Design a binder for these strands. Structure first.
Ligand SMILES: [Zn+2]
Lengths: 345, 216, 49, 49, 48, 169, 48, 96, 169
RNA sequence: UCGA
DNA sequence: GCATCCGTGAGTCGAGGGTAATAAGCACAATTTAACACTTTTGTCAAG
DNA sequence: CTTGACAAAAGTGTTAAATTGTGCTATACTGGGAGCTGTCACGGATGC
């Protein structure tokens, strides 16, 4: 059972005292700024030796071994760096070790206030992610708040962390939610609208008409706007939805397939094609061939008057009147024969 | 008339409800009752075994008589596998079809034994391996009757020792799942199981069966 | 019966909402919900067997 | 033939069902005492007797 | 599932019977069972 | 190296030799005890199943997950105007969510705990998009008790694509 | 009535729950404009 | 269904009975040309419309769906021929 | 062009599966809520699986059969029938390797019968709960040195890799 | 849920 | 080997039936899309 | 069939207006949560 699993996995470590908290933040920031001063040392970048710290701390080669087929070169961009600062005097080395212990501190910190995250996200169930899923995204929120927090602020880390938790959570549900992808601002305005609708549904003692709720919103909000975003609201309905009073009556197999041709349609198209194909020979040998271009027959792509004119060596005007007389000669044969009179839709 | 349940009981080779006890050889008949357990010793000239029986189920044979291989003792249905390895495949077929037709004819439905026979032969067509010998087989690795027949023949010609085997009777369900084509059993039931044991073993189908084709 | 359990869902809609907030502006006007109850009972009359 | 961007959506009647007409009721969106689906304009309902 | 505390053994178990809302037993059940066992009772719970 | 989860099982199953265990199980089968004899029978059964077929068991740990074509997992609207779709879609979706989120966590050097847990969710999610219900209560469309029908859900069963579409139609 | 535990200030408010279907004449409710009915259910009476 | 404008289904037992008669083609056409076959139904309508005789079907096309499903399960689906060789069931379709 | 008399089955390997795929499905999202066009990487993507329209590209610079199979440079959709939407698969590259619950939880349990494992054993192993022993490297356990083909737990894994401590209040 |  | 658990099944076609309702926000950068201006193509017309 | 003239259809270039994607909020919030029943038969793994 994967749920109660993490439930006992979090309580495996104590949370923290104020002391431990401040100490954690202490060695964290001192470590990171040590990485800064280290960036001034061998000329390395700010973020470079940082992730390199993860290279020799978070484990052996397992870290960058499989981050997709492309993340960042291990034997090239990492290896030499790991050996470039090994040659360096006491100062740069002490800064090194400071970096190591600092990042580790970041980790421990994260786990405690991860217990915290667990509670917070535990209150958010039913967003389309049952428990862990939700929680996990929520967790990473704290992570971003871990590096952005300062012990100097004299605030319990729980506060900052919490707000960032609700951040990660709401962004995650905004980006996942219904099966149809929806933009973040869009989701915002959605839950905004439904908020209002809820409120004045309870106040008015009844459900609001489109115009009064849309008015309750503000400027530019009308019945059509709410009706619109309401149409977008509802998600795709599952095909596996059983209908009727039985189990065996399904939904998915009740949908017609019009995206593909039908036998009647296949023979219909083949028919128009053939019947018109033989109706072709009764036209002037030149004007028929020309007519195959202007109407987009030969290669499927319609050729302009200029092109067909560039074909028979005649001006485009010629091709034009050619089309007039051709289509009308055909018109005689049609109005007479009454063979192709069908296909009138 | 136990009816359809009796039928299924025969077709699936499932353990009979009342199931009767049978002898494993031709011995001598002896009754032993110490007022506790009513047991009956069947002892050949050089052998013996007894059988634990209750005082309730009424016996068939009378004390001091002679017995036969797989001969009945208590009144009631006989376990298929029980007489299978006892009296042999012949009498297996015999009693099988005989009972099925017993119920059928009882209920007023007459049909030629042929059909039932086809099913029955399709039940016993598998055998368990004993001492693979020169063959590439493995002990207790169970396969079809036809195939092991061919195998043994070829090995006889080659001057190589054949394989011993025990006739193994199973229910029709089991036979459907053990059939050549994975497609057939896949269609039938226990899909997951079959598909697994098929795909892993990389077995190719020749579409020899009808429903093993009808899919295609 | 359905009213009992549905209104219990609404009871969740009560006990939980009344503490995120400020007891200053408070009244069942803003504390009472509809959809848990109204849709529970809406559910009994249709999708039920 | 003009290609008329407007195509026929018209509602026919199934085979085997035929006869006269009694009930004819049509309510568009916004009519008194009516609500429609989110993104529908009108609806028409006719009885066939 | 959850750590076997003391104070939580006074809670998780309480809701099972004593809670009138989680054990709610029809006025008929209380009735018939009462006159059945040859005893008497009022509350629709098991134990108060 | 204690590594836990699927990567490890990949390791061992990638390191195996069927030849050695073949001959070994052969000599282990002749054991006069019917127990060892029988376990050898079955184990060597599956062993031979991997041998003759010429198939490598490491594939069972498969990395790249085959995605079913879109038209096989249809999404289309109706007269009502709303859109519908199969369940396998949502399954696939949430799966990719977990996989990607994991990927964003791994490179940034996230704590090992969250990582491991996310890998757990990866396995459970995949396996859910296959056999759903084989482990725990199946993942369903949120709020509805209707289980999300996976591959193995359609392949087998009464109205499954077998009996419903290939043995009758 | 909403009563504060601290100030002991009773603030009474009447609210609107929603729309609950009511029974028609013959005993058949109208849901979604269609005449429907609730068929009686049966189970072993609660008790011992 | 009726108002859905659709044909009857041929049950498993129906199939079995049909086989019992030993009508091989009737069954084949049933499961292929007469039902969902890719060009089968189409070429059929073509045939009878022209008065010719309906050609022989290739893929039932419910079958092909089955195949690609199995592909989604990473079941290698190998269709051989008279002697042990890959046959392309999907014409030029996924060759990558 | 050829009679099909035979149907085989086997285990699809990761590389094979990659070859089956026309691309990786990245963004776990159906389509745009506005355009209803398959999302950039979305599961319904026409850019890899197949065109939404018959014998056409996406952006519309190739609208016709005069271009056959030629990949569009402004879109990257092979111009062909939408039929390929049913026959062309994708794949998802999973960060950490993951097994398949089929041969795991099935009655014979292939992977288990192979590695000489047990049901609930491999159950907590594979699912990222319990550790296992891969090359102990002179590792000690309670006086009996641990060897491979064995299981460990969290506490003892850290205890052996990071040492045995005691915290005194 | 109701025919057969 | 002896009791005790997860696991897999279980009748045919149909007729209909069906439709629905939870959750934070605000500034801002980054693009996308809609608007607009204007060059060119092409189809039409007057008239060789 | 042809030349010039010209209206509209169409092409292209540049912007304004919209849509959409991102980051962050500091008192303190630090181990879920929901229940459900009135089979039955057999096969296998597993705990006695
Ligand atoms: Zn294009």
């Amino acid at each position: 059972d994967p749920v109660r699993q993490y439930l006992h996995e979090i309580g495996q470590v104590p949370l923290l005292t104020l002391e431990e908290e401040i100490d954690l933040a202490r060695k964290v920031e001192e470590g990171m700024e040590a990485i800064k001063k280290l960036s001034e040392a061998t000329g390395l970048d700010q973020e470079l030796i940082r992730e390199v710290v993860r290279a020799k701390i978070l484990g052996t080669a397992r870290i960058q071994k499989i981050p997709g087929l492309k993340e960042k070169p291990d034997p090239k961009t990492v290896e030499e760096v790991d050996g470039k600062l090994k040659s360096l005097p006491k100062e740069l080395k002490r800064y090194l070790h400071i970096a190591r212990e600092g990042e580790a501190a970041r980790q421990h910190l994260i786990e405690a206030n991860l217990r915290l995250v667990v509670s917070i996200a535990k209150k958010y169930t039913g967003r389309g992610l049952s428990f862990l899923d939700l929680i996990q995204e929520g967790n990473q929120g704290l992570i971003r708040a871990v590096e952005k927090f300062e012990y100097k602020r004299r605030f319990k880390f729980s506060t900052y962390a919490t707000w960032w938790i609700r951040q990660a959570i709401n962004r995650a549900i905004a980006d996942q939610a219904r099966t149809i992808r929806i933009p973040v601002h869009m989701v915002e305005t959605i839950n905004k609208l439904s908020r209002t609708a809820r409120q004045l549904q309870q106040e008015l003692g009844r459900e609001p008409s489109y115009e009064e709720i849309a008015e309750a919103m503000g400027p530019g909000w009308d019945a059509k706007r709410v009706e619109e975003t309401l149409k977008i609201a509802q998600e795709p309905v599952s095909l596996e939805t059983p209908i009727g009073d039985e189990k065996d009556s399904f939904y998915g197999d009740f949908i017609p397939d019009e995206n593909l041709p039908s036998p009647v349609e296949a023979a219909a198209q083949s028919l128009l094609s053939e019947e018109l194909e033989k109706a072709l020979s009764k036209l002037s040998e030149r004007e028929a061939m020309v007519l195959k271009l202007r109407k987009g027959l030969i290669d499927g792509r319609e050729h302009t008057l200029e092109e067909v004119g560039a074909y028979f060596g005649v001006t485009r005007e010629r091709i034009r009147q050619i089309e007039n007389k051709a289509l009308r000669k055909l018109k005689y044969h049609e109005s007479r024969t009454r063979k192709l009179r069908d296909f009138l839709e | 008339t136990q009816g359809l349940p009796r039928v299924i009981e025969l077709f699936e080779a499932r353990r009979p409800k009342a199931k009767a006890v049978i002898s494993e050889i031709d011995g001598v008949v002896r009754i032993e009752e110490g007022e506790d357990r009513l047991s009956v010793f069947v002892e050949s000239e050089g052998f013996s075994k007894e059988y634990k029986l209750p005082k309730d189920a009424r016996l068939l044979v009378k004390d001091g008589d002679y017995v036969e291989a797989g001969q009945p003792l208590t009144r009631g249905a006989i376990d298929p596998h029980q007489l299978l390895e006892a009296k042999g495949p012949e009498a297996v077929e015999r009693y099988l079809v005989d009972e099925i037709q017993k119920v059928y004819r009882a209920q007023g439905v007459k049909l030629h034994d042929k059909h039932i026979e086809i099913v029955v032969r399709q039940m016993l067509k598998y055998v368990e391996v004993t001492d693979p010998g020169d063959s590439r087989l493995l002990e207790g690795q169970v396969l079809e009757k036809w195939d092991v027949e061919a195998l043994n023949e070829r090995l006889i010609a080659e001057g190589k020792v054949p394989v011993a085997w025990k006739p193994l009777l199973m229910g029709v369900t089991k036979s459907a799942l053990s059939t050549k084509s994975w497609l057939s059993a896949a269609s039938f039931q226990n899909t997951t199981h079959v598909l697994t044991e098929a795909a892993i073993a990389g077995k190719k189908d020749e579409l020899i069966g009808l429903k093993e084709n009808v899919i295609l | 019966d359905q009213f009992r359990v549905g209104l219990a869902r609404l009871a969740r809609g009560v006990r939980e909402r009344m503490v995120m907030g400020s007891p200053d502006t408070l009244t069942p006007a803003k504390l009472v919900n509809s959809r848990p109850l109204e849709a529970a009972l809406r559910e009994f009359f249709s999708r039920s067997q | 033939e003009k290609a008329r961007d407007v195509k026929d959506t018209s509602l026919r009647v199934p085979p085997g069902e035929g006869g006269i007409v009694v009930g004819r009721l049509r309510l568009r969106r916004g009519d008194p005492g009516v609500e429609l689906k989110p993104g529908v304009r009108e609806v028409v309902r006719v009885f066939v007797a | 599932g959850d750590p076997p505390k003391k104070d939580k053994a006074l809670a998780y178990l309480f809701g099972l019977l004593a809670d009138p809302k989680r054990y709610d037993l029809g006025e008929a059940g209380r009735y018939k069972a009462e006159e059945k066992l040859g005893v008497g009772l009022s509350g629709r719970t098991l134990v108060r | 190296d204690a590594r836990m989860g699927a990567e490890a099982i990949q390791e061992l199953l990638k390191e195996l030799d069927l030849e050695k265990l073949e001959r070994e199980l052969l000599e282990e089968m002749k054991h006069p005890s019917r127990a060892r004899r029988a376990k050898a029978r079955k184990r060597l059964e599956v062993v031979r199943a991997f041998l003759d077929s010429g198939n490598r068991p490491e594939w069972m740990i498969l990395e790249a997950v085959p995605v079913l074509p879109p038209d096989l997992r249809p999404m289309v609207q109706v007269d009502g105007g709303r859109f519908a779709t199969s369940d396998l879609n949502d399954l696939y979706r949430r799966l990719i969510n977990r996989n990607n989120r994991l990927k964003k966590l791994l490179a940034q050097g996230a704590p090992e705990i969250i990582i491991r847990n996310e890998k757990r969710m990866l396995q459970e999610a995949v396996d859910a998009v296959i056999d759903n219900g084989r482990r725990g209560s199946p993942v369903t469309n949120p709020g509805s008790e209707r289980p999300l029908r996976s591959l193995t859900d359609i392949l087998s069963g009464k109205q499954g694509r077998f009996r419903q579409n290939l043995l009758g139609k | 009535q909403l009563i504060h535990k601290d100030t002991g200030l009773i603030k009474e408010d009447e609210v609107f729950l929603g729309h609950l279907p009511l029974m028609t004449e013959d005993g058949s409710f109208i849901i979604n404009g269609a005449d429907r009915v609730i068929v009686s259910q049966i189970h072993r009476s609660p008790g011992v | 269904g009726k108002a859905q404008f659709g044909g009857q289904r041929f049950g498993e037992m129906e199939v079995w009975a049909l086989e019992a008669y030993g009508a091989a083609h009737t069954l084949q056409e049933m499961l292929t040309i007469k039902s969902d076959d890719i060009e089968g139904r189409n070429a059929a309508y073509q045939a009878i419309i022209k008065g010719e005789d309906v050609p022989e079907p290739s893929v039932p096309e419910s079958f092909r769906v089955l195949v690609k499903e199995l592909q989604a399960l990473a079941l290698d689906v190998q269709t051989l021929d008279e002697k042990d060789n890959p046959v392309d069931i999907f014409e030029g379709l996924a060759s990558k | 062009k050829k009679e099909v008399r035979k149907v085989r089955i086997a285990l699809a390997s990761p590389e094979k599966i990659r070859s089956w795929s026309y691309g990786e499905v990245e963004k776990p999202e159906t389509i745009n809520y506005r355009t209803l066009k398959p999302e950039r990487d979305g599961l319904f993507d026409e850019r890899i699986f197949g065109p939404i329209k018959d014998y056409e590209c996406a952006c519309g610079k190739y609208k016709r059969q005069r271009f056959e199979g030629k990949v569009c440079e402004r879109c990257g959709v092979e111009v062909t029938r939408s039929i390929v939407r049913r026959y062309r698969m994708g794949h998802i590259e999973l960060a950490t390797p993951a097994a398949h619950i089929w041969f795991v939880k099935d009655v014979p349990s292939k992977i288990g019968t192979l590695l000489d494992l047990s049901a609930t054993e491999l159950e907590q192993v594979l699912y990222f709960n319990k550790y296992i022993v891969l090359d102990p490297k002179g590792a000690v356990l309670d006086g009996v040195p641990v060897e491979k083909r064995q299981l460990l737990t969290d506490e003892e894994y850290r205890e052996l890799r990071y040492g045995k401590q005691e915290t005194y209040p």
